[PDB]
């Protein structure tokens, strides 16, 4: 009727060749102002893991991973308590806590979800009723979103281990020393970035649909920085404040603001190399 606001369609499939369930959800939304908005979600779950030897291999690697994270958390508690307190001015220890927290969250989610499979058993009792696999897909998505960030930080941590000669050491020194002062300009640049974002959201955020939301405005500005979006629709959106905004943004934040980042890095590297070269006139 005219009163409806949302419609869902749900089902799932097995594809017995490989061992991967696939749950399918289709949403259709009816805004009160008229129109239709579709959305879809296909999720490849896996619930019957232990069949082949590779599955036991993966389980063993999971156990070893739990042992490793337990080892790291123990050696971190030992270091925080039985050694220097408030050792947070390093950025190399504030990274370990993030990694261990993300890992323990992932393990907790896995224990919560994997141990919760009785719905499959209920479906296997009688197979003429709708299976309820929606929660499992959501938790699988959440687990993937955590593992994908955990692996990123684990890879990032490797930078601590590359100082095996003069060149890498000096590059690391330049990169670290150039972070204390780039922080201020980053803040001052993001303030103007958000000022442009809110201005665009308030002005064009009603007829363009690229500026229809604040984060969408931020993404549009980043795309313009990459050089992807053209203002061929902004004039239709607005003829007074359109070209003015576009020109001001592409001039002030692409010819002036974006070069201080180059200048600071260039000067820091130059002074660092000069200092390290002068470190040989004394020896």
């Amino acid at each position: 009727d005219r009163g409806t606001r949302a419609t869902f369609i749900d089902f799932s499939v097995y594809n017995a060749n490989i061992n991967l369930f696939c749950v399918v959800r289709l949403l259709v939304e009816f805004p009160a102002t008229g129109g239709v908005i579709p959305s879809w979600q296909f999720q490849p779950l896996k619930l019957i893991r232990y069949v082949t030897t590779f599955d036991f291999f993966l389980a063993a690697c999971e156990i070893i991973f739990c042992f490793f994270i337990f080892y790291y958390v123990v050696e971190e508690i030992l270091e925080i308590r039985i050694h220097k307190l408030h050792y947070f001015r390093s950025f190399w220890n504030c990274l370990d806590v993030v990694i261990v927290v993300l890992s323990v969250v992932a393990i907790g989610i896995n224990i919560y979800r994997t141990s919760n499979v009785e719905v499959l058993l209920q479906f296997l009792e009688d197979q003429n009723t709708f299976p309820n696999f929606e929660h499992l897909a959501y938790w699988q998505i959440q687990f993937n979103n955590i593992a994908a960030v955990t692996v990123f930080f684990v890879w990032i941590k490797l930078f601590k281990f590359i100082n095996f000669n003069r060149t890498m050491s000096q590059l690391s020194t330049t990169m670290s020393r150039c972070a204390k002062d780039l922080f201020g300009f980053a803040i001052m640049f993001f303030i103007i970035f958000l000022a442009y974002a809110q201005l665009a959201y308030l002005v064009f955020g009603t007829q363009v649909d690229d500026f229809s939301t604040f984060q969408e405005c931020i993404f549009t500005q980043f795309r313009i920085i990459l050089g992807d979006i053209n203002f061929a629709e902004i004039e239709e959106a607005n003829r007074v404040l359109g070209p003015i905004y576009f020109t001001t943004f592409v001039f002030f934040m692409f010819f002036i603001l974006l070069n201080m980042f180059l200048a600071i890095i260039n000067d820091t590297y130059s002074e660092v190399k000069s200092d390290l070269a002068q470190q040989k006139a004394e020896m």
């Binding site: 005219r2 805004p31 009160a32 102002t33 008229g34 129109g35 204390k180 002062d181 201020g184 300009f185 803040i187 001052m188 303030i191 103007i192 958000l194 000022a195 442009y196 809110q198 201005l199 308030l202 002005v203 955020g205 009603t206 007829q207 649909d209 229809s212 939301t213 003829r239 404040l241 692409f254 010819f255 002036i256 070069n259 201080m260 180059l262 200048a263 600071i264 260039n266 000067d267 130059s270």
Partner: protein
């Protein structure tokens, strides 16, 4: 007599923005007070002429004594050091009183002193401070100047049995701006232990508690007086909002007195460091509960809550704190009746600058809050506006309309897609019949040579204004059947392609129901209503969505650059029809608040204009101030004009709804402009928030290296523009030239030079 509503999820941005502003201002003010307190901590151990008490009245005084001196008088009070002399207070050991006492009022009773020694002493009594007029002349060099003893009665002007009046007046004069918490973050007496910073914690605690209590009472207590709701008009009755503000302030006051008592007299060994924690909890909790109770405000009580909070703050500042200091003075006077309540002189200008910055910060934060409200008060019916305009554009088949060139398919288009859209079973309630105002020119056009268009449209002339008949011109008996329908002065300027149009022309009502409207459409089609010159067509009717509460002005335009070809353009502008007579809606309050700020800036500018005199021109600051004032005034005036125009149009409509049009379009224009201007104004403020980042020793260079290299950047841009005009005078480019990253080298060189010159 309580309720846990949790009705919806649509957050109310007003409370969130107010809380965010109140915490940000506290953070920055605490940052400033950190240095303002470190200076006092370092200084832990003219006002008048050079005080001199160098005398030799006594001998054999190889002991020590303390001679305290108090410079009484309004707005000036400070103690003095001990009675240390040139020979350790021994025989004839008295030096000039060259102690730093910058507190000294005018020709008032600025005289008070006392002496405390190890019991008694010989006849060593320094006469007085012989300072008549050398630097400021706060008093004359004449007093009793004779033998004295401990607790000297150093009275004066420019047993004492009446201890009552003297004790009360002294205690009030000393504590009228110290105990008073609000304006004490500026006038803390030195050597005290109340730390100059937790004074800000008390203030932020009061603000957050006021906000929380008011947010609870509004929308959490509607049983005892069920006076709230639909029967409660948001307009300030001046009998109710002030009452709830007062009662909220009174009920929340005791916990403040408890936390202050835990602060004062704490060094109680170290409990002060606990108290901060408590505050950092309570305010948060307060904010939290606001963010839970304010999410379900009806759209009219939000202004009432702000007024209640303002009244509550103004109540605890206009008598409650004075009452507390008065009762404290009486308690002291009636309990224990205590009788005593270029090297290193550059810091004075530093303290003055810090006080000025602290005073300007509050005005900046208030202006930021009011402009944030003016901008995002209704930042919830904003995505809905986009969805509504997209839906209207979609169901009108905008693509099918923007791809018509001949002036013949317009009739099938209207008969097929538009008329079924206007009428039907329910079919998108309209609120207004359509119109077909039309212009002729009278300057008959001729088709261009083969080809769509050579450069542009041309051959314009004088728009026709005479009367005509069925078919065209034939006025025989009386008034023509197709009158001109003279344009209104409000609502015009569509700004098409060939020229700038107006609201004048020959109109058609296009009937009421589908059958009669279609028949009349065909009737006027066959009788040659639209085949002649007929520059424009101007189909535009209305739209209104009750579910969200937004109107939409829809305008369709076909334009004729030449006889035979057309150009299509449509505009759907959504807005919210908020009348001026609707009470004290938030936009009206923000508009009347912005005018006060504009007046304040104008007054502050004129007070320096006339102080320095004329020829203050040629200074960038004056131009910047006079442009900011103009922008603020323009914003306020445009918003007020939109509010007035909405009411005018709505009254005109409700007058003759059945067969009128009333053209709400102009309102949709103003609501746009009043939303653009503010959007720019806030922008400026944000930019300012970047510049004031220079108050960091490390980050002060990022502004200097950009203000120093401005001539070079302008020269490079000049080179760019001259090469660009040369590129066309011989008759890409910008991309290759900008790929040079030319500004980078100038910025790098300037940065290197500034860093080198920083040490």
């Amino acid at each position: 007599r309580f309720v846990f509503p949790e009705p919806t999820a649509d957050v109310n941005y007003i409370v969130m923005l107010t809380c965010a502003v109140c915490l940000v201002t506290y953070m920055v003010m605490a940052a400033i007070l950190h240095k303002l307190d470190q200076l006092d901590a370092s200084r832990g151990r003219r006002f008048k002429y050079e005080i001199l008490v160098k005398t030799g009245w006594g001998r054999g005084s190889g002991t020590t004594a303390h001679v305290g001196i108090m410079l009484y008088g309004v707005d000036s009070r400070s103690g003095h050091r001990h009675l240390d002399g040139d020979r350790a207070f021994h025989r004839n050991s008295l030096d000039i009183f060259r102690i730093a006492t910058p507190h000294s009022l005018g020709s008032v009773w600025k005289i008070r002193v006392w002496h405390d020694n190890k019991g008694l002493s010989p006849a060593w009594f320094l006469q007085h401070v012989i300072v008549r007029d050398l630097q400021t002349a706060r008093s004359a060099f004449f007093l009793v100047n004779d033998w004295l003893s401990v607790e000297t009665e150093a009275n004066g002007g420019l047993a004492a049995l009446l201890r009552f009046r003297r004790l009360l007046v002294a205690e009030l004069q000393r504590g009228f701006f110290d105990k008073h918490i609000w304006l004490s973050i500026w006038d803390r007496p030195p050597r005290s232990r109340f730390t100059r910073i937790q004074r800000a914690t008390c203030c932020v605690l009061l603000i957050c508690l006021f906000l929380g209590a008011n947010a609870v009472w509004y929308g959490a207590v509607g049983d005892s007086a069920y006076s709230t709701g639909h029967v409660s008009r948001l307009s300030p009755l001046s009998v109710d909002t002030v009452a709830v503000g007062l009662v909220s302030s009174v009920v929340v006051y005791p916990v403040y007195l408890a936390i202050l008592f835990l602060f004062r007299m704490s060094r109680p060994a170290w409990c002060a460091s606990l108290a901060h924690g408590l505050s950092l909890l309570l305010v948060a909790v307060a904010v939290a509960v606001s963010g839970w109770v304010g999410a379900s405000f009806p759209p009219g009580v939000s202004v009432a809550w702000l007024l209640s909070s303002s009244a509550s703050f103004l109540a605890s500042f206009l008598g409650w704190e004075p009452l507390k200091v008065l009762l404290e003075a009486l308690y002291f006077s009636l309990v224990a009746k205590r009788l005593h309540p270029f090297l290193a002189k550059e810091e004075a200008r530093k303290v003055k600058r810090l006080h000025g910055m602290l005073r300007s910060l509050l005005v900046y934060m208030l202006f930021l809050l009011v402009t944030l409200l003016a901008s995002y008060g209704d930042a919830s019916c904003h995505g809905h506006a986009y969805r509504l305009q997209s839906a209207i554009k979609q169901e009108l088949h905008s693509r099918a309309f923007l791809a018509i060139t001949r002036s013949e398919e317009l009739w099938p288009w209207m008969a097929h897609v538009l008329l079924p859209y206007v009428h039907g079973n329910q079919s998108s309630p309209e609120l207004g019949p359509p119109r077909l105002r039309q212009v002729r020119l009278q300057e008959a056009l001729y088709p261009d040579p083969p080809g769509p268009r050579v450069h542009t449209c041309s051959a314009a002339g004088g728009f026709s204004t005479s009367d005509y008949d069925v078919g065209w011109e034939s006025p025989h008996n009386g008034s023509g059947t197709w009158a001109y329908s003279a344009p209104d002065l409000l609502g015009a300027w569509s700004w098409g392609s060939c020229a700038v149009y107006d609201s004048g022309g020959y109109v058609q009502e296009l009937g009421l129901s589908l059958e009669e409207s279609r028949d009349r459409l065909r009737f006027l089609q066959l009788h040659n209503w639209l085949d002649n010159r007929s520059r424009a067509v101007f189909l535009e009717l209305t739209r209104y969505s009750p579910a969200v509460g937004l109107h939409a002005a829809v305008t369709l335009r076909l334009e004729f650059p030449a006889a035979g070809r057309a150009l299509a353009a449509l505009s759907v502008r959504p807005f919210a029809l908020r009348r001026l007579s609707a009470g004290l809606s938030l936009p009206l309050l923000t508009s009347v608040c912005l005018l006060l700020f504009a007046v304040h800036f104008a007054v502050a500018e004129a007070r320096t204009w006339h102080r320095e005199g004329r020829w203050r021109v040629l200074r960038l600051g004056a131009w910047a101030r006079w442009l900011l004032v103009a922008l603020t005034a323009a914003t306020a005036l445009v918003r007020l004009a939109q509010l007035g125009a909405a009411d005018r149009q709505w009254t005109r409509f409700v007058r003759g709804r059945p067969r009128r049009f009333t053209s709400f379009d102009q309102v949709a224009q103003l609501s746009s402009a009043a939303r653009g201007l503010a959007a720019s104004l806030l922008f400026l403020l944000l930019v300012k928030a970047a510049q004031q980042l220079r108050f960091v020793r490390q980050w002060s260079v990022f502004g200097k290296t950009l203000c120093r290299a401005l001539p070079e950047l302008l020269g490079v841009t000049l080179g760019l523009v001259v090469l660009g005009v040369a590129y066309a005078q011989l008759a890409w480019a910008l991309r290759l030239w900008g790929a040079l990253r030319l500004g980078a080298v100038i910025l790098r060189w300037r940065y290197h030079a500034l860093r080198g010159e920083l040490y």
